[PDB]
Amino acid sequence: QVNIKKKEKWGIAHIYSSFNNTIIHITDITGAETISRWSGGMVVKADRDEPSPYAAMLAARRAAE
RNA sequence: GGGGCUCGCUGGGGAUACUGCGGGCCUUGGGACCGGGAGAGGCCGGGGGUACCCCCGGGGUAGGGGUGAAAUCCUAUAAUCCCG
DSSP: OOOOOSOOOOEEEEEEEEOEEEEEOOOOOOOOOEEEEEEESOOOOOTTTSSSSTTTHHHHHHHHH
């Protein structure tokens, strides 16, 4: 780590929004580094719940840690 | 005895509105010109950006695709995704 002056980091979060699935994907402000990728069909077992809001909160909570 | 008759013909005289023809004359129609003017009219040359796809490098893992459910099919020499 080369000295940080601000002591705050920022991560732009791309949100790709389908009626077949939801994808949440937060990267660094450049976009050149992928911390974490989590979708709505690892959370669940079935295709119907692949989208919805409830996958699209839980997917966006695992990343967030 | 009187009339009409397909009734498609002819000769002579007469009228001159209309029509024909001939001549003359005029701008209401038409055409024509000049100047201002809008438009996804046509053609030609020039040039920019969107998004989709594709290909290459990096980053990043367990999926994705698809449906009412599914399967065939995409992806593990790495897909989707994100960055260049």
